[PDB]
Point group: D2
Chain length 414, copies 4
């Protein structure tokens, strides 16, 4: 009856389109992360508190412009705004910080980039958006520059030119993820071909189970105007339907006049689009094209996803230290929300890259008997689901842990 459910049960994709209902309200919480770019319009601590409230999950620091001192101020203001919501363990929203490299601008790996990457390690950024990646070797050079101290930082390679599109498979192999950087791409290849690059990369990253970001001009007109155009809302919604894990604001939040409204609008479009995904085809095709595995965590993850669909579970609660188990559930694009309980503050921030994943930083100290410790973390996950809406008593939930994460439990919520 709601969240496009009658369209969910269509027997063909054609008929699923026909059953889309503008009065079927999205009920699930919004699962595609919003990356906002920081600038004069979004730098004060008070503006950042607003943006978070509107739905910003990841803060982008664009190292094309601005001195190390400038970006250090940006990072401090973001942390200040975030911590101002750390009243309670269950109210905390992690916010990730991504550093976007300058690269080879014109107005191998530049000496400026090596300094900026050392700055970002020294300040503990979670993510590097690496500009203009053309081949695997370029990724290797960024990882070397990050050094042993930046070992847990994720590398999202920016595909921006013809070479990088044609070497995509080798680039994705060694990357944590991809950004479809439509800005330079649409100067570097014919403008009319970008949607083809975009759809091919999103599809390949979905198949590989690695996050993919759609970027640049998604709501451009909102730099000067309070409502976006019809092409712009279409573009956000279709990025989500393509498969994107994240969507992005650049000038809209970094310099325009309605940064908070831009975040709200991407949040509003993403939630309508997630409900309009035809999971029936998506799940059969990922199952079918995904190879047999003997990784116990992958095997448990696909089993949990099947069981969640079967009982219309409101949520899968996953216990994870590195994010990996949450990333493997995200890949099968459940409709249930994936609540990832973690003690790793960095993994909590990074799992925003994965669609459908809501990170929960657990703070209580361990329990002597591991099974008690597991149960506390699981109840923590349940409590935050109740608070945040999408767990009613009576719901069934799937729980995923270890005892590798290799256990799946089906639990009805009292």
């Amino acid at each position: 009856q709601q969240q496009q459910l009658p369209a969910a049960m269509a027997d063909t994709f054609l008929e699923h389109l026909c059953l889309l209902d503008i009065d079927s309200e999205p009920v699930a919480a919004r699962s595609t992360s919003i990356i906002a770019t920081i600038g004069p319009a979004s730098r004060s601590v008070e503006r950042l508190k607003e943006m978070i409230k509107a739905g910003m999950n990841i803060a982008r620091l664009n190292f094309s412009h601005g001195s190390h001192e400038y970006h250090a101020e940006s990072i401090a203001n973001v942390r200040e705004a975030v911590e101002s919501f750390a009243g309670s363990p269950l109210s905390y929203r992690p916010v990730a910080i991504a550093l976007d490299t300058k690269g080879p601008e014109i107005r191998g790996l530049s000496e400026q980039d090596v300094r900026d990457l050392r700055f970002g390690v020294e300040h503990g950024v979670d993510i590097v958006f690496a500009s203009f990646v053309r081949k695997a070797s370029d990724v290797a050079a960024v990882r070397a520059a990050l050094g042993p101290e930046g070992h847990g930082i994720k590398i999202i390679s920016k595909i921006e030119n013809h070479e990088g599109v044609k070497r995509f498979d080798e680039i994705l192999e060694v990357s944590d993820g991809i950004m479809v950087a439509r800005g330079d791409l649409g100067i570097e290849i014919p403008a009319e071909k970008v949607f083809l690059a975009q759809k091919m990369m999103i599809g390949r990253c979905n198949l590989a189970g690695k996050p993919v970001v759609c970027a640049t001009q998604m709501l451009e007109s909102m730099i000067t105007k309070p409502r976006p155009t019809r092409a712009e809302t279409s573009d956000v919604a279709n990025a989500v339907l393509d498969g994107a894990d994240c969507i992005m604001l650049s000038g809209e939040t970094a310099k325009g006049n309605f940064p908070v409204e831009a975040v709200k609008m991407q949040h509003a479009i993403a939630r309508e689009a997630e409900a309009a995904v035809y999971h029936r085809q998506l799940f059969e095709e990922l199952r079918r094209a995904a190879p047999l595995s003997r990784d116990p965590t992958e095997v448990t993850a696909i089993g949990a996803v099947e069981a969640a669909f079967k009982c219309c579970a409101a949520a899968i609660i996953v216990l994870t230290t590195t994010g990996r188990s949450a990333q493997l559930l995200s890949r099968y694009r459940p409709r249930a929300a994936v609540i990832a309980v973690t003690r790793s503050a960095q993994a909590a921030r990074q799992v925003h890259l994965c669609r459908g994943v809501f990170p929960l930083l657990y703070r209580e100290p361990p329990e002597a008997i591991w099974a008690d410790d597991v149960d506390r973390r699981v109840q923590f996950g349940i409590e935050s689901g109740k608070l945040r809406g999408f767990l009613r008593v009576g719901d069934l939930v799937i729980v995923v842990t270890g005892w590798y994460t290799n256990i799946m439990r089906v639990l009805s919520i009292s």
Copy 2:
């Protein structure tokens, strides 16, 4: 097969993606180096205005790819449009001197439509947020407009907006929420209010008629001047389009009516509107004011899918390349929007201010032509044909049965074209519905049907001018030959190509034929 067509053949127009066993794998195999060689088949509607009224501009626009010229009767005198129609025909008819290359151009009339308007002020006034404005239909205030009093020319507004309902003013610029009904309201979003501005009542069952007194005059002008198509504004139910069809009357019997779905009621009564219409416009401009902006894409995708399944033309409209009004290159959201209207299933895409008043009308037509051509090739025909078969009602219609056999035949052999002979357009429409990769070359003696089948994706109309042959078999054969030789000249057909020829003795014969 390589032996006949080469290796390069099977690398082009996304054929490695076309043959994937899932939609996911079809996406993974799209390739920016696979060139789209088939001719662009989604028609382009361009609105005429000061940027595009000169005869020489219009020829450039025709060469760039414009197929349907849209006259927007929201503005302009009857005189003004008669000179639009005249310059269009003069540009179009300057290519008649070589029939093999002549491109028909349809002329469509987009109505002003039933409207809700504020009055004249006491100039400009400013509605400031928070303040309280009165909304009145007392005739004493038609001319007494102030920043706390607004008159509207729609008496029944007081009955169709409930308490807390919203009222939109000047393209959703200003907004008001009702507080009391005696309508006292509070400015939600404020701004400058001019005079005789447009009003929108999101979610309301407005009882304005299907057309306005000025529409009746405008439609009569259109029939008299021989327009091919009406885009009928603000269609909410079937009685609305029956009223447009009565106004056209007998002189206008064969004008196609494309109903513009602009508001919540129209979306919910879609099935009854599409059934008495020749087709649909997804009018996203007004629809983004009348429903939440973030739900327009749902309405778009629902309406295109339902038209596809019915087999009726569907136009996507409004703000596709908006930034090109001032800049020479579009945004990334804008090229994506055009490509995804085509992938969604649209028959036609449209330009408004990009061609009516902007600095780059020819370039915007070029841009839509280039994207469409790329998006057509990325269509996953495998899944689309199968699903259209798996849902579409078994047919005892001989012309439709022929149509599905010929499209399947064309897919089996990589046919370059389906060549069909039609007099109304109906046989080409039935072919267009199954979305062949092959071009549907429609040879007709009806000048008007040739213009009108531009509404159908995949159809290239050719106007045969020669008088009958005594033997019906030789006139048939002469008309196929005109399509072949037109097709070779335009680059749709090469020696060695296969083609499927569809003709009458209903059009119930298909033939497999080699070119030259």
Copy 3:
């Protein structure tokens, strides 16, 4: 290497048609044979030493045909089976439970050396070539004899024997026999000529309060049973497609239509279905079957059948042990030939959503096993219900079912894919350890019988506590 066995290339074909083209006679069926075999007891199979040979060859269910034989005869049948079963119990990792099914006489009609009837029926209480006595006085008729082979103004020739079956397109006897079965502990009733739900209720009534645990399999044998099938299935524990009478009651050429329908609807309902009668009929006198007969067995498995049956092949013929060996060899090859990709996918869609945590855990475990080519799903069950919910989604991995209930062990033979293992140790204080020991018994038993191998992966399915659902699924590496 591993992808050469078990028809694995066929299993990953993108279409059904291409699955058939990839079937390969050199792909060896390594998985253990999971379709259960029912063997009818008779002079060719009632002795303790024959029963032992049958058990070793694959017999899972011993059928007592109560159309013939005294109560004293059948009680020694039961005792002879139990004695052969329990001679293997000094080796608990290899011990095979064997169930006992009672097949009722029902409303048989029969006639009273031989004679040629050439191309008069009385119920007056001495038959000859022109008179036939029938034990059904009330002929109702405005008539077939002997499995339909003779047909007939006076109340299609051939030889007429004696006491031949008669076809006309709950008795007091039936009631003594059902109560006899409860006294003697039978696991299953095959209830002849079921035509509606009321027929099953009457059986459950004659079974009474001591017999609440007995499963009831309704035999579909005539046109009415076929038409009211949905009603019958709803209230029965399962179905038998009794092709014998059905092929006389409706036209012989329509039986396969009824068989494929009943199997499909039983698969959809997750209830067990048996295919019965003449499957290897020529093996009654021959040491090897016909081409039509090995085909019938294989396609019964392909159709969806949970069990397959022998009657005269094992009750009276000269090669009973060979007939069991041959159903076993065929089912093993057919099981590997099933197209699970389509079957599992259609079972998902057609099947309701469920809130039952056991049903939900079960489908997750079958998805997990398919994803990693699990050799087995090890399930703990006391009633057999968890095992049966695993069996209805038709995994390729063996469902090894560990139970303490000796009756449940026997009764789960009805569910395709389930191997029952009876566990005997008294609990431990801690649920945790009691669980682990029963799992480990399953692993060790499975290693010993050739079901599991170091390096394999298994899915283990149990419950978080003792009174609740079966709602834990664990992926485990064999070591």
Copy 4:
């Protein structure tokens, strides 16, 4: 009716769930029936009853019987067929099934009817030394195939007397093959030998087969069922005995052993079709594996669009009884659902007491089974797998069966001279009866090899103008259709013809019946 609700289901499972013993089949039966001609079916009056019960193809088994005996069978068959001229008239094809190469043991010391017992576990020497040709005993078996000693290796197996005795080679040496009896039994004299999994280098044709194919040609048969085909060069041999044009005869290759199953694709490429020869396959490979071989071969033949025969023991018990077993009706039904174009009877028609009943029974089972095929999925899968084609006749064919499915057409009327046009429709398995109008008497017999093709022989001389001559042949198809129940006023039918005489079959037309 025609199980049409089950036809419409969205899944295969649901299709099964909707089958209905009271949904009566209406369409004409499309799977051909081959009957083997022998003493129970040789008389002209008997063959008449057999044509009426539904025989389409008369098979002659040259494993037994003289040329004079078969000549007489052929004459009676043709006399019975010709008796129905003056026509509603069923063409009947004649197939020659060859004896084939064989391997046999020698004579035992005790002579022809003697027996000796080979005891499990004993040592038995298999020898080709001809001084044992008549001296076989319990420890020594002679065989007429010298190269057995170099084609069966240590570990290999030698089967004797229809698979009943089994020996495992233990040692190879100048005296022959030292075996151990794995399966013992009573051995007689001159018993058939099978070498499971061997590459047997016997030739494609026996001496007897050369004389019989010459007889086949001279008496004008339509079909050869060629025995023991292992490899393409065995087919090339059959074809050379038949000559350069092969006189039009169709070569249906019999797959009977392991080598042929594994070299199936190369055999099919050069054959007109296949017979699944389950009798010998069941000796040559484990009996429980034969359904695998059958399902693969039928599948591959459907893919390729070539005819496949299911053969042997389909209704065995009817040799003595008037009603078959439940496993036999099921076997017939499942060969149809599998996709077999043709089904067969051997002893059931050749020597049993119920030959007309057996034909009747296959007829009744095939009709029911044909209505139960799941055309939605089958058609969809035959489309995806069949490759692109620039052959105009094949392009028209797929266009025509898709049109036929769109409107639930009663029939496709096709004009064909060689049968090819009718075979390209048949490979897409339409529900619509394919009505093939031909002037060629031999193509009318031979299209019986294709499921769903009903031949009509046209005897009228050609009109002066092609378009007239075509319309008359089309009209003949309509009017015969009506008379024989294929179509009726109200139906749609597809009409497949050619634009020119001597060109491609490149036209399709949709017609309402009047």
